[PDB]
Design a protein around this ligand. Structure first.
Ligand SMILES: Cc1c(C#N)cc(C(F)F)cc1Oc1c(C(F)(F)C(F)F)ncn(Cc2cc(F)c[nH]c2=O)c1=O
Lengths: 539, 404
């Protein structure tokens, strides 16, 4: 009902563009009747105003009544106006996370009633919101209106509403520093550590300040009670959790059923520790239609069963205490899966999460662990404005050996070793110098670009030699095949000389996981050797 | 009174994401911005401003106070015609030839000059909110901002008037303005040089300018490609020597490797000792005299961007090359130490500072780090008021070996 006496936000069209001039399609008599009734009510309430014939703009209107109801809705198609309207600043950078909330004695939800219709539209822009209710069979001139408030479906409404609420709340915020107010869409979530009586007094004073600016909110009888159900979460007085999750039991799983399941598992993973989705995600790889049935592999069945067990008993997170440190612990789950928990007091988790190994990468657990530390660090700065102290399953010596030899600059903030197997380690190490009394293999690999045929082989200082033929190969594959040949045919100590910077760079980084069968084959050989020296020579 | 600023046609103002900031940096920024808004330097803005430029908080070189650092890299690229073509500050060739170069921050000079009303919208920045409690605190500039290349370009006439008596009284001192700093070079004895710096600080002080730091560009001698001096030479040693010489054959004209290639005749054991011939030893000595001299045929092309590559050599050592065309080096050097990210930010600042002194422009860096690792931490150790362009590379296994 009220329209805020707040100052308007000046709005422009995109440079070089004029307002929309989209023709109104003739409508049925029942649709015209409904629109006239709706519009007469909005004009009465100050939301829209009748315009003269002068205005050359037009945006189409439609009337929709759902068959279960006898209520008509006015629908305005602002697609053309939105395309011609200036860009606005983004509404929010992120979304509030429950783990980042501090515990409050009392918390109140105040949702603004008819939010957009309570905020005025820039007087110079109103003319572009012009719409026409057509006459019966478009016989005579239609009834023309323009908006005076923020229209539903218009590009600028969310940002202009938000900045209006910010400008309004500003004095109340300055005068009440101990009251927490979260702004989200049409809502205000207000918390305090006052005794219940003065919290209700402060809430009435806030609602009264907002009413002074045209914003209506619910009173004591109508305002929500905990637990608050918000954006897939449950907010209880001293704990939070994700809303109920039911994992369906189907005879046949479709691509759509599996996508829905993976989304629910990912959503539960922010508070249920150990949730895994690798095997279920592998099933979604490919060119498969939404309703196509994908049989579960034994591995996806194993993973689905493990998830059901985790989710069988409800799990909650605690709220944040800004006067304490955040501790993040990470565990290796196998096959590139990593799980983590963040707590302040052991072991009452604020939240949990997971990290997965990058696809098609030659990599090791030290690199995956560094990536997981980085992901957690960034997420922590977003939620709490600080980095946690880490507890990692890697020895200080293993990390020290890694970072001192790696070509890339790498670092982990404050951390301590925690003995939680499986531990993170490097599975082989290249020699620093050529091995004496070890056989030197001068390996070679080449592939013809036209026939795609390759040859991979070696010549040794001891007289040994081999050449093997390969089909539908590349230079890269033949130079990895040549290194693999020397590994297969050598003793426990071997000096290998290659012309490949490609192969050298992969092996030098001590990978132990690869999507390439050939790299994995080389890894198996490297682990088994006692001493391997690898050198590069120009062609 | 204000100088009208136009963007490059076809390009719009910056719309860069604000990177997450810690609570202490946010509190530092809210305090600085509250004070600048009281003074009218900046103003709160509405949502009808769709522009954004990232903002950070760093520790000053002179104190333990927080300072605002705005990343205007995108706005600078989008106004390159104004600050470079329209109002270019010429680069003096004599600056790198000076015994001492002192770097003075003069960024406080710009707060006295109002910004063109129609350009203010492009200087929008946001102070983020922890856990998205509130929408970001949005502001735009009302005066010439620090970090924007149009600022010294506009202040140029005022700076000339400020420096006129000092320059007239000290004709052999070179003063060069780059972004928010003055580079003051002289051939005076260090104590006489410092006295002139303090005298120049008094001149700036009369115009409200209350005042890296001490460089010696004449003592800058490039790190050559180093060939080892050995008593005995294994097969492996000669192969590494050939690889390193093959690399400098593409750079330096006249490098020879025929006689040393002849020594690797066959498929010998890597550990096997090979005696050096008279011819290969002469060839080795001739290559050493070429490597110790500057590269013949390599010249700075002002129409091309400078590129800087850095390699981590272990034990707190880092090497670097500055070039425009790959491997046609304009400068080579080394940096010595702190954690890896701290050492790397320090190397980037040292290399950019030398680049500003030699060419009057910053290089685009190829950083040997993970994008996310660098992006999270670089701000903890940054002390400069400028920021260079950077990208992330996977240092080739032998580019490191050729520059060890
Ligand atoms: C109501 C609400 C909702 C909803 N619906 C959604 C969000 C979302 F932003 F996280 C926040 C939000 O408001 C809360 C805030 C607050 F900070 F925002 C402000 F109220 F103090 N701070 C903490 N909690 C948890 C909590 C619940 C309770 F029953 C009693 N005591 C408590 O501490 C909130 O629920």
């Amino acid at each position: 009902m009220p329209i805020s006496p707040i100052e308007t936000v000046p709005v422009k069209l995109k440079p070089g563009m004029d307002g929309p001039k989209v023709k109104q399609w003739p409508l049925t008599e029942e649709k015209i009747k409904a629109l006239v009734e709706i519009c007469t009510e909005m004009e009465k309430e100050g939301k829209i105003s009748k315009i003269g014939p002068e205005n050359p703009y037009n945006t189409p209107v439609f009337a929709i009544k759902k068959k279960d109801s006898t209520k008509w809705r006015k629908l305005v198609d602002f697609r053309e106006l939105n395309k011609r309207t200036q860009d606005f600043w983004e509404v929010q950078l992120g979304i509030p996370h429950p783990a980042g909330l501090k515990k409050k004695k009392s918390v109140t939800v105040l949702d603004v009633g008819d939010a957009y219709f309570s905020v005025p539209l820039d007087e110079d822009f109103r003319k572009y919101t012009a719409f026409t209710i057509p006459s019966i069979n478009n016989e005579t001139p239609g009834i023309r209106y323009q908006y005076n408030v923020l229209p539903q479906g218009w590009k600028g409404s969310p940002a202009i509403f938000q900045s209006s609420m910010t400008k309004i709340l500003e004095p109340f915020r300055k005068q009440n520093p101990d009251i927490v107010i979260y702004q989200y869409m049409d809502d205000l979530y207000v918390g305090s550590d006052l005794e219940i009586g003065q919290h209700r007094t402060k809430i009435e004073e806030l609602r009264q300040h907002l009413l002074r600016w045209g914003l209506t909110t619910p009173d004591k009888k109508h305002q929500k009670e905990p637990p608050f159900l918000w954006m897939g979460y449950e907010l209880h007085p001293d704990k939070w959790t994700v809303q109920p999750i039911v994992l369906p039991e189907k005879d046949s799983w479709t691509v759509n059923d599996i996508q829905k399941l993976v989304g629910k598992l990912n959503w539960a993973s922010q508070i249920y520790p150990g949730i895994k989705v690798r095997q279920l995600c592998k099933l979604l790889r490919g060119t498969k239609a939404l309703t196509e049935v994908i049989p579960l592999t034994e591995e996806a069945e194993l993973e689905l069963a493990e998830n059901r067990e985790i989710l069988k008993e409800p799990v909650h997170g605690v709220y944040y205490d800004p006067s304490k440190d955040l501790i993040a612990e990470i565990q290796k789950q196998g096959q590139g899966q990593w799980t983590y928990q963040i707590y302040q007091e052991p072991f009452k988790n604020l939240k949990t999460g997971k990290y997965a190994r990058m696809r098609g990468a030659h990599t090791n657990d030290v690199k995956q662990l560094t990536e997981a530390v980085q992901k957690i660090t960034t997420e922590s700065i977003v939620i709490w404005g600080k980095t946690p102290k880490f507890k990692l399953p890697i020895q200080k010596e293993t990390w020290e050996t890694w970072w001192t030899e790696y070509w890339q600059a790498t670092w982990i903030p404050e951390w301590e070793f925690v003995n939680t197997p499986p531990l993170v380690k490097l599975w082989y190490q290249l020699e620093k110098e050529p091995i004496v009394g070890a056989e030197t293999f001068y390996v070679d690999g080449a592939a013809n670009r036209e026939t795609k045929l390759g040859k991979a082989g070696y010549v040794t200082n001891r007289g040994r030699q081999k050449v093997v033929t390969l089909t539908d190969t590349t230079n890269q594959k033949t130079e990895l095949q040549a290194i693999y040949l020397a590994l297969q045919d050598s003793g426990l100590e071997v000096n290998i000389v290659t012309d490949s910077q490609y192969a050298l760079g992969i092996i030098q980084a001590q990978p132990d996981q690869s999507e390439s069968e050939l790299v994995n084959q080389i890894i198996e050989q490297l682990i088994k050797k006692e001493k391997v020296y690898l050198a590069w020579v120009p062609a």
